Amino acid sequence: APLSCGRNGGVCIPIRCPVPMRQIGTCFGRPVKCCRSW
């Protein structure tokens, strides 16, 4: 689905998750991902 990160509750960062933030889901499919500290 588009956007995504709603159920996960995180931000949609493209490319890869920037540390120390950890990935917590995906966004727009596989191009963007969800990233959160907790």
Swiss-Prot record:
Broad class of where this protein is predominantly found: secreted
Q: Which UniProt keywords apply?
A: Antibiotic, Antimicrobial, Defensin, Disulfide bond, Secreted
- Which Gene Ontology terms describe the biological processes this protein takes part in? cell chemotaxis; defense response to bacterium
Enumerate the InterPro entries for this protein: Beta/alpha-defensin_C, Defensin_beta-like
**Found in which tissues?**
Neutrophilic granules.
Q: Where in the cell is it found?
A: Secreted
Tell me one GO molecular function of this protein: chemoattractant activity
Cellular component (GO) terms are: extracellular space; specific granule
Q: Name one Pfam family in it.
A: Defensin_beta
Q: Which cysteines are joined by disulfide bonds?
A: C5-C34, C12-C27, C17-C35
Sum up the protein's function in the record's words: Has bactericidal activity. Active against E.coli ML35 and S.aureus 502A.
Q: Which family does it belong to?
A: Belongs to the beta-defensin family.
The protein here is known as: Beta-defensin 12
Gene name?
Answer: DEFB12
